[PDB]
Amino acid sequence: DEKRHLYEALLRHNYFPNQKGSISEIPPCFSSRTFTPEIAELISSDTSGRRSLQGYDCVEYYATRYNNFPRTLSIIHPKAYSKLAKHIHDNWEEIRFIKENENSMIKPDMHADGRIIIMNYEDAETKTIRELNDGFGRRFKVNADISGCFTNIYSHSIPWAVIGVNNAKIALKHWSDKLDYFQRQAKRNETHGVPIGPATSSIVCEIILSAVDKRLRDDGFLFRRYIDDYTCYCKTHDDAKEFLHLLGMELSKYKLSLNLHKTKITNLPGTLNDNWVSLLNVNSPTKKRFTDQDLNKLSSSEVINFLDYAVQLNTQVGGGSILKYAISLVINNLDEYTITQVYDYLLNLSWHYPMLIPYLGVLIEHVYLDDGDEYKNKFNEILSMCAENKCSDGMAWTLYFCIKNNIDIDDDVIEKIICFGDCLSLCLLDSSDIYEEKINNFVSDIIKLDYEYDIDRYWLLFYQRFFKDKAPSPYNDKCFDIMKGYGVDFMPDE
Amino acid sequence: DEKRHLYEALLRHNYFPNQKGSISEIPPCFSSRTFTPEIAELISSDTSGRRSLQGYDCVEYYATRYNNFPRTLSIIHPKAYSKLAKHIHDNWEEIRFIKENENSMIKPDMHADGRIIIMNYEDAETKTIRELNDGFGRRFKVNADISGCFTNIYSHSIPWAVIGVNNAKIALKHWSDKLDYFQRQAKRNETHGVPIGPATSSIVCEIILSAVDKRLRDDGFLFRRYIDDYTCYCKTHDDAKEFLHLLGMELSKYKLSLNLHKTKITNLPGTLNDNWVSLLNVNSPTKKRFTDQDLNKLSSSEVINFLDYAVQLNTQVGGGSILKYAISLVINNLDEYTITQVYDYLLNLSWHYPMLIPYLGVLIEHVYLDDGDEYKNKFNEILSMCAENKCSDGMAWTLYFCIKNNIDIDDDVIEKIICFGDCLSLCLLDSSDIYEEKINNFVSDIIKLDYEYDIDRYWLLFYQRFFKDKAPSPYNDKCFDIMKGYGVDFMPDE
Amino acid sequence: DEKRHLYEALLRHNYFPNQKGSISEIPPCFSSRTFTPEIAELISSDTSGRRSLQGYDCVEYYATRYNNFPRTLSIIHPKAYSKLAKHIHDNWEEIRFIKENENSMIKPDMHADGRIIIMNYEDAETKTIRELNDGFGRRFKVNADISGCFTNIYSHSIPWAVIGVNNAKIALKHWSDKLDYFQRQAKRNETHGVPIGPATSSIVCEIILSAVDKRLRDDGFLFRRYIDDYTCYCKTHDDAKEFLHLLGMELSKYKLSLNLHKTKITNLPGTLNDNWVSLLNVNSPTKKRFTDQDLNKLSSSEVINFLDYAVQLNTQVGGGSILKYAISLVINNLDEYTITQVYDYLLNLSWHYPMLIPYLGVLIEHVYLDDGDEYKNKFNEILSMCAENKCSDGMAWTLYFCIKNNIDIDDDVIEKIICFGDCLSLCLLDSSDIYEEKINNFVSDIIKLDYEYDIDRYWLLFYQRFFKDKAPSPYNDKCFDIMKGYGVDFMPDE
DNA sequence: CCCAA
DNA sequence: CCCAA
DNA sequence: CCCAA
Ligand SMILES: Nc1ccn([C@H]2C[C@H](O)[C@@H](COP(=O)(O)OP(=O)(O)OP(=O)(O)O)O2)c(=O)n1
Ligand SMILES: Nc1ccn([C@H]2C[C@H](O)[C@@H](COP(=O)(O)OP(=O)(O)OP(=O)(O)O)O2)c(=O)n1
Ligand SMILES: Nc1ccn([C@H]2C[C@H](O)[C@@H](COP(=O)(O)OP(=O)(O)OP(=O)(O)O)O2)c(=O)n1
Ligand SMILES: [Mn+2]
Ligand SMILES: [Mn+2]
Ligand SMILES: [Mn+2]
Ligand SMILES: [Mn+2]
Ligand SMILES: [Mn+2]
Ligand SMILES: [Mn+2]
């Protein structure tokens, strides 16, 4: 069944921000499996406990983008997420009209690993064929995206996009009103915005934007959208301005507006990908496959010169993930001679850009970690700068690398981790069990603060301490006991 | 004999604009073989008929350059061209002094296919050796070309360049005066300019410019010329200015002048080819030959990224045929997996630039033209764009592709073809025989206009309708009957 | 022993400017072997003769840099150099503290060929690993070099850097005061500057700059130096300014100052090499080794296009030896088909840039030098332009190529060689023996000038004429007779 | 080798 | 094929 | 690996 696949995707595969297909933003130690549909079915049925504050807060995660900009990912509290996933699954025969959208390329699908929503799983050549077919006969292209799409979704517009704005306002129950209520309860009983990273909020964004896609399709516009980014192919410039006007109208019906910084009109024939994609791919040392494994093993000079050229391209242009793409080009074709030099280059670059930190794990097995203690200083310096820069992806990834490889962590950098106080880094330190007393003091300060939302911001740390029998449940409800008795661990071992 | 080779080259190989060696501007359906020496010798002997207007007009052809600029090629009326070719050949012992010019790189030669004049047949490495030898010891280079060379040749300067300006003016018969008269009769009895595309007018341009080459050679200038483009290599900047002054003097003796837009002086060592030639060739996926056919078959990613990089370089520089060179680099090394994707890229690019339309025929055999009817809309959209842009090369090439592959043509674009009214497109539609009535109405309107020059502009269409016995001969002379009786078809089948 | 290796390095390997490891600035006909420590020990013991002028002048050599700038190399007179080398060797247990410097990368070492000091023998990958290790954790890099380092070394600062500035001034014998006196006698009894090219003056520069390296190391600065170029890696911009201030202080203690033109602060991550290094290496046709000799033999088009792209990169940037690196990339991977075309390209480029003249000797064997006399005009034109530009490296290299390949030299270019009057070109003409009378007139004019320094500027020519018994010794001392009796030839045959 | 002029 | 949105 | 400084 496909409805059951929705349930398993919502809880076990796309509860955490696992939407990135190439490499996960969150380290693989955190996971959402062994959280079955039956367990959320029990949690939604549970009525015990009482909370002074309406709604729930979420575990916060600040991931660096290509330009070192923070992106706010959220892990929803399992009570609110269990109710939301239950209500989404129980009415998928009313919701699955977002599956049959030809203008939304990123949408729920029945994938092999189980995830409904994977960003950029379709790969650039299937994108290339479609972009070539769409761009034919048109001489202008429009790139326009919503300004704050996920962060300013108005939750009460969820009923509107289901049944029309006017009919929903006149009717002021239906399933989408309850979906509105549950999506509000997911984030502090707040109507504006949705959490970023779970697939329930991406489903909500698909539900809202599918009405705009429908009313743009009915006017004969040939357009594609990737989440919030609309690309349009127009024969004339006036049709481009008319598409922009109609898109602004239909988004303004749902309290949404265009990002006019990124909204631009270019003259076809433009590059199908970005410019730096083609510049890196013509200069790539692995752009030709020789079908024998010895011939495509790159020497040290080739990889080093490609990485320096990529650094120059990223510094000169700065309009995309040049370094990310470039290191992912040449990281699997190394031989054992240049593993250490490329690892040193990646260590320097991953210090200078935290987004390149997750790559080290694919080269961390071949490099001898002990060596002359130098890599311990490497990782501690990266940890310290990650604490100063208040980034979560690099910080958690570096802690994962230190713990998984039995690499010692200094006390001063533990103190600045405490001062940073991001939830998932503290969950990793809790899993280390060395710093149990300092984690105890931190969660104790959260407890005597007496704020429900501050406990909700660290529910994952509190539940991980509860699962190893090191802390009582801060909540008076039985959701944590239901999760523990039925075996839910968010840091599972093999 | 070399004189006989001249006559066969003039009639069967270089009557049509066939000077491009890589790919013909005119589709292969139009041809000038089965127009033997004997038929031209008969037509020159014919004295029947009468014409109210002196001279003849020519079939007009508008070919897009690299920057989408129209270039006017002309197909001379076979009476005038037959007389002109006979007069050129019968005195080749007086004319062949243009063969022994070391400064004219493009000139008549005894080629394998039969053509006397092929532009850029020597290839860039034989050009490289000569350019390296010429550039040595000189630190300045001059690039200067005639402003409107073929379009502003004075016909009366043809006797001058044979016997001196002053001697010919004092003498005011000689063979060059009759060559003047015949070159005038080729284009409406007009002294100014020559038709572009036949080799008789290129022979005339060689005759005129060889005197300038002689009086530039006598002063010791080391220079080369490609038709009208003069390159010069000077040790000093003042020798460059003196070469420019002497070239201006000797061209002004023949009512000719330099294009000072393209006249520029650069500092050696400059590159032998253009810049984008070098950037395309260092980034080319086929720049190394592995001597086995499986290893140099390019994958889809390599060709797609090279074409995208070529599009970026053509947009950024815009100083040459970047896209033409780039697709000719990688079009023969494809495998069957990327054939359809490259065809889609070529279809989009050939819509955006008509000069890339002739390439499609090398990939039109492998691609299934029926498919899901999409390629018919591709070709019809390209046809409508070609009719809007008033280009003849892409429009006739697309007609050739539609007719040769049994691809249907919509009626609206047929009406827009007739509105355009190019001669060779109407010849192709005549060859299709579906649109016989509309072509009949068009040539009937031309007939009731009662203008000799308007019939001469479409003589090829009129003769093709006469050859299939669908229209009477508009001319009262017997040249068309001589051509029909002895078997001249300008759309011959194999 | 390592002290003996110092002696053999000082006399037989690094007396001449042989510090460049890739290709020697001086042609290999000039050499300093068969000049053993015994002969220099004899010359230092010799007390015969008398000189009116204190000190000695040195043979002058003007080598073009990458930007065609003249660099002044000097060949020290063998009396002064023998005394200086003996005094350097006899106290190496006091001097070898420059060997144990971790901040000086170019320093004396026990090399395989025998040289103590080779510029950039470490190769760019060993530099890459060290640069990656140093660049970690730092976000600013400082590049600062001494303004006139070798040309404005104060000789009296040689004692200071040995024993402290204040102690040496208070003491105003010690071995470093005698090293001061001998380094003064090496160049005209002048305190400012040292000759460039011998290793004794590089030893002196290491001695002076090691105190600055020590007092920069004691402050904890992580820095490297290549002769006079200091690179520093600072976490903060303030520490970068503090490093610049302290470097200025410690250099000003020794009458030295930074070149603020080349002193700059860049933001890490910057490229390990220069930019054009990476651009040339991603576009290099030989960047992949296929481990079979037939597959990496480059075709003509690849080398021609790479050289054209390199010419464009050198013209566009002009910040390094783009052409030197580029031709050294692809000169050993040629096959016999493109040898002549690449040799012609090198002939044109080596005319336009004399630095590329030494490369011709690696392709001069395969190219037939007789041919149609054209290469004789090539070499004579290059000789003439080398005479006009007053450059010594290309001029002497071209004389070496003409003499070694039995290529005739015209009389007019011999006359402008005479007018230029560089010493090593005249030594090569002396070795040719054709122009013995003109060399005799030139040295006779030097003799009747009656200036000791003007004889010292051509001591190499005078000694080479003495060794073939064609001229008497201009000096009244017995150093030349000691050198002749023990078999010292600076133009030795195999 | 593969363009243009 | 290998990014992002 | 292949330059410079
Ligand atoms: N790992 C994930 C999971 C989900 N999303 C969602 C949230 C974003 O709203 C949407 C794409 O929108 P943008 O990245 O363009 O971001 P915004 O719309 O918030 O802002 P802006 O237009 O200013 O960039 O993708 C994401 O970015 N990253
Ligand atoms: N297929 C052909 C056959 C012949 N020619 C001739 C006619 C041109 O006059 C000549 C070369 O001249 P240019 O292309 O430089 O063009 P013009 O001299 O007419 O103009 P301009 O200098 O403005 O470009 O080559 C051509 O261009 N194309
Ligand atoms: N063949 C050789 C042998 C030795 N050196 C030395 C002398 C130079 O002083 C030193 C490097 O310093 P710079 O080339 O930077 O030269 P300067 O310090 O004299 O000048 P500037 O900073 O203006 O370039 O290397 C050299 O350049 N070439
Ligand atoms: Mn957005
Ligand atoms: Mn977006
Ligand atoms: Mn012209
Ligand atoms: Mn310096
Ligand atoms: Mn021209
Ligand atoms: Mn320097």
UniProtKB/TrEMBL annotation, chains A, B, C:
Coiled coil regions, renumbered to chain: none
InterPro entries according to UniProt: RT_dom (IPR000477)
CDD domains reported in the protein's UniProt record: RT_Bac_retron_I
Domain Reverse transcriptase span(s) in chain numbering: 1-311
Protein name according to UniProt: Reverse transcriptase domain-containing protein
